[PDB]
Every structure is written in C-alpha cells, then in structure tokens.
Write a protein that binds this ligand. Structure first.
Ligand SMILES: OC[C@H]1O[C@@H](O[C@H]2[C@H](O)[C@@H](O)[C@H](O[C@H]3[C@H](O)[C@@H](O)[C@H](O[C@H]4[C@H](O)[C@@H](O)[C@H](O[C@H]5[C@H](O)[C@@H](O)[C@H](O)O[C@@H]5CO)O[C@@H]4CO)O[C@@H]3CO)O[C@@H]2CO)[C@H](O)[C@@H](O)[C@@H]1O
Ligand SMILES: [Mg+2]
Length: 513
C-alpha cells in the first residue's frame, strides 16, 4: 500500500530479481561482446538463438511487479501537495524502468499501463520521459514529505533532481541521430534545470544491495535483497561455465594498455573453488605474464571448449598438487580470461547512472557543437575516463590507479582523437567499458552510437550456427502471450514494424545497424 515501500521494492528488483538477470547473461553481454564462452552466453546471444521465453524476462518481471507497483503508487500519490516528493521520485524511477523496457523491445505500454493498454510509440514514450523528468524536478521541495525507503540516495531529494536531469542528458543523447534538434534542446535545458546534473561521483545513483549467500533454490527467486546479476555472473554451474571474457573486450583493454585490464579480468584455476561462492580460486595471471603465456579470450560465437587453447604447466598449481594431488598443474581453459572476483559479490551496487557517463555525454555534446559550457571536449573526456577508472576503486574494492599509470594510458592509446569520428569512437568505446556493470545501458549506447564497431559471429567462423540470422540482433521480441492478453494493441505495434516481430528491426532511436 505505502508508496515509500513500493519504491524500495522497485529499486531492489532492478538487479535483485534472479529470474530477470538471466536475460543479461544470455543476450546483452554477448551482443556487447563483453562476455563469451559460458554455455548460456554463447548459446543464446553468441549464436543468435531466438527463444521467446528467454527474451520475455524484462517485460514480464517489470509489468507484473515493479512498474505495476510504481504506477499504482504514483497514481495514489499524484495530486497531493503534502506527498509531492515521494510522487516526484516515483515518476523519475518509473521513467527509468520504462526506459529499460522500450530500449529492449520497441513500442510498449506506458501511458495506459497499470485493461487492454495501447502500445505507445517509442517516439512518444521518449517525449514523455523528458516531460516527466522536467515536471518531477520542478515539483521536488525538501520542506514537504520526506522519503523513507530510498536505497539509492537515502532520501536526499536534491540528488534525485541531479539523477533526473542526468537521465535527461542520457535520453537526449539517445535520440541525437533520429531527432538532432530536440536532442540539443533537451540536453541544454537539462543543464539549466533545478538541481543541475551529477557533477561528481558523490551523487552517483547506485542501488545498495546486502550480502546474502548465493542460492539457486526456489526461495531465492523471491529474494531481491542481493545483487542477483553478480550471483548469476558467478554461475549456477560456476566451475564449468563461469564468466569468460569476450576477445573484443579483453583485447580492447589489453592492447590499449588500459589500467583496468587485470582489475576487470583475471586468469583463475577453479579446481578447488566451492560452489556457492568465488572463494579458494587460484590466480595465475601474474604467473602467465612472467612466463610469457598467451591469453586466449573467446571470439564472438565461441565456447570455452572450442577452440581448446594451448596451455602451460603452472608452478603454483604444481605446488598445490603435492599436498592434494587431485590438482592438475597443466592449465588449458584457465588461460581464458574471466571476470574478477570483485564483480562476483552480492555486495556489488546496482548501477543506474554515474558522473563518469555525464562526462562522456558532455564530451559528445561538445563534439556535436552544442552549447554546453566552457570546458573543452578533450578535458570532459579525460575527466570521464578518470572517473570510470576510479569507479572501480571506490565501488568494487579494486586497486587504485596512480596519477602516473593514468597519464601514461591517456597520452597513448587512451587518447581523445582529433577527427570528430575519432572523438566519438573514443568517448563511446570508453563509455562501453564503464557500462560493463550496467548491461541495459551498455547495449543501448552501443546500438545508438555505433561504437565500438562490432562484427557478427559469422566473421569469426561461426556463421553455420547463427540460427536466428546472421546480423547481431538490435532488439528483443515481444512475449508471445501478448497475442492473447492484449491482441489489438499487440497487432498494432507489429503493423508499424512491417507485420513481423523481428529482432533485426531497428528501434526508432537506432538509425544505423
Ligand atoms: O550440451 C553441450 C554442453 O552443455 C553444457 O551444459 C549446459 C546444458 O547443456 C544446459 O542445458 C544447461 O541449461 C540450464 C541453464 O544453465 C540454467 O540457467 C537453467 O536454470 C533454470 C532453472 O533450472 C529453473 O528451475 C529456473 O526456473 C525458475 C524460473 O526461471 C522462474 O521464472 C520461476 O519463477 O522460478 C523457477 C524456479 O522454481 O529457471 C532457471 C533459468 O532462469 O537451467 C537450464 C536447463 O537445465 O546449462 C548447462 C551448463 O550450466 C556443458 O557445460 C558443456 O560441457 C557441454 O558440452
Ligand atoms: Mg546502431
């Protein structure tokens, strides 16, 4: 009933729902070519398997829970002067959750959602995002009702203005190909709105999750207290099918001399690792470097087992073997980079939006000749990269990158370009690294900006397996069951796309493939 508790639940579900996070490991992480090799990632997204049920998870999870609850809470709270803050916060978080739906699937229920709700055109949903965030920002008033269930900003309603105006930046940059004039105007208005935007890391929008032991039992699916994305990236089958990194991502980090290379990824021997927890793994990364062993990250479409890499004999593992000889010294699949333990904790925050992103958005707007302030595009980009690197230090307990290590990176392969194209590539490639823990935003921004320039699994010699088509999908399909619950509205949506629900159909804001 209570709208403040409704907000809590909505925030927890965003990364707490173990059912929903399957979609990100199956599809998003493969489409963005950040992870590859894990059976689920490779089979589904890596090889373009059309599976309606796997594609439906965001739609179902939100319309039956968070978004339904929030819409209700907003409606009960709407026209109350004495409840104007909780109202405005709900409106802002409603917009965010809706942004995930429309960015996955195209046209969708918004205005009439919460008996046979229309599928609002994506254009008009985005129209509503700006209007909603602008009104919410203007209604916030810290003298009125206080917010009690807020796991992002603990009720700091000033920081909600910063988030709202920051989301305005994000959505304005999103529509900057389809509708440049509106994009510019909405971006410049957002900078001038009450509260401003997120100018530094202390106003980062992060959902606070607790430490609960990972469980894949039935009771676990109703428990959103933990970060279930991190739970899943550890794995239901963690020894055989862990989060192996994709070569596009690992090679970007490694070949650019990126300081985060061995903060995001390690090579681990997992023979002695427990199920349930990433404890007792054996880090062989430094050993591999010292001995000159090639890393073998997984090309798009590849499993961990094919191609089966040349390895080496680990002296560390040979040491372990004398005391308990069920350990192999001979490494094979372990030379394949995996996601570092820092990113496999239920502690991990739920990333909504960061100061690092705002910097990249500011840099891009500057490159596009918008009127955004007096700071240079290059400086904005540099601040963005610094913030994205420090994001790991502050939130995932990674090692600090020294001023010297940063300066060496930024003056060489991390450098802002000179050409507009080069600058856009740099900003958006770097933003792609930042968004690793925000898959929803990572896939949207990859599709929108066109960077990094990803190649289809077909180009890596896996065309023979690309069951659902050759090109990397650019959306996910509506759940089949919408055909019977919401037929008229469902059929109208599909008539706009050409009469088929195709996952190669470009979303309205996506102009190029
Ligand atoms: O065969 C070649 C290759 O296989 C590898 O092993 C694979 C195997 O082939 C796959 O079939 C197997 O697939 C499992 C998925 O990994 C796993 O994610 C999924 O988990 C299910 C769970 O079992 C199910 O109960 C759960 O139901 C919940 C619903 O999702 C919720 O909506 C509902 O509210 O609550 C229920 C719970 O009551 O859903 C999850 C998914 O969300 O199960 C799949 C089928 O078993 O994966 C194997 C690897 O893990 C092998 O490793 C290779 O070596 C080999 O060459
Ligand atoms: Mg595109």
């Amino acid at each position: 009933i209570d709208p403040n508790a409704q907000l809590t639940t909505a925030q927890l579900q965003t990364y707490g729902d173990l059912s929903m996070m399957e979609i990100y490991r199956n599809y998003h992480y493969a489409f963005t070519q950040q992870l590859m090799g894990c059976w689920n990632t490779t089979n589904y997204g890596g090889r373009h398997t059309l599976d309606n049920n796997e594609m439906s998870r965001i739609w179902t999870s939100f319309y039956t829970q968070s978004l339904k609850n929030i819409i209700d809470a907003q409606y009960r709270t709407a026209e109350d002067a004495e409840k104007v803050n909780i109202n405005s916060v709900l409106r802002i978080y409603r917009v965010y959750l809706m942004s995930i739906i429309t960015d996955t699937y195209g046209d969708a229920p918004f205005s009439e959602a919460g008996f046979n709700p229309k599928y609002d055109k994506q254009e008009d949903i985005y129209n509503a995002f700006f209007l909603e965030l602008e009104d919410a920002v203007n209604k916030i008033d810290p003298t009125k009702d206080k917010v009690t269930g807020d796991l992002i900003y603990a009720g700091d309603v000033t920081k909600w203005q910063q988030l709202a105006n920051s989301l305005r930046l994000r959505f304005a940059m999103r529509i900057s190909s389809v509708n440049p004039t509106k994009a510019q105007t909405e971006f410049e208005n957002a900078l001038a709105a009450n509260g401003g935007v997120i100018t530094d890391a202390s106003s980062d929008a992060l959902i606070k999750y607790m430490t609960i032991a990972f469980s894949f039992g039935q009771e676990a699916y109703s428990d959103y207290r933990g970060n279930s994305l991190s739970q899943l990236l550890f794995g239901n089958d963690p020894a055989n099918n862990p989060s192996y990194l994709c070569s596009t991502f690992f090679n970007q980090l490694y070949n650019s001399g990126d300081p985060r290379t061995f903060k995001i990824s390690r090579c681990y021997y997992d023979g002695l690792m427990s199920a349930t927890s990433p404890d007792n793994r054996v880090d062989i990364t430094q050993e591999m470097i010292e001995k000159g062993i090639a890393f073998s990250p997984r090309d798009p479409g590849a499993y961990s087992w094919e191609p089966w890499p040349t390895g080496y004999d680990s002296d560390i593992c040979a040491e372990l073997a004398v005391n308990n000889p069920s350990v192999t010294a001979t490494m094979a699949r372990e030379v394949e980079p995996k996601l570092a333990n820092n990113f496999l904790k239920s502690d991990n925050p739920g990333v909504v939006m960061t100061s690092a992103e705002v910097k990249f958005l500011m840099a891009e707007a500057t490159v596009k000749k918008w009127n955004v302030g007096s700071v240079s595009a290059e400086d904005l980009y540099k601040q963005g990269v610094r913030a994205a690197i420090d994001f790991l230090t502050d939130n995932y307990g990674c090692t600090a990158t020294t001023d010297a290590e940063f300066d060496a990176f930024i003056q060489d392969k991390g450098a802002f370009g000179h050409t507009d194209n080069q600058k856009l590539e740099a900003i958006n490639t770097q933003a792609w690294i930042l968004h690793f823990t925000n898959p929803a935003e990572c896939w949207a921004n990859v599709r929108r900006s066109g960077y990094p320039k990803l190649k289809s699994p077909a180009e890596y010699g896996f065309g023979q397996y690309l069951t659902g088509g050759t090109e990397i999908p650019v959306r996910l399909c509506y759940p089949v069951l919408e055909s019977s619950y919401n037929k008229k509205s469902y059929n109208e949506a599909i008539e706009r796309m050409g009469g088929t629900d195709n996952w190669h159909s470009l979303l309205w804001w996506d102009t190029e493939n």
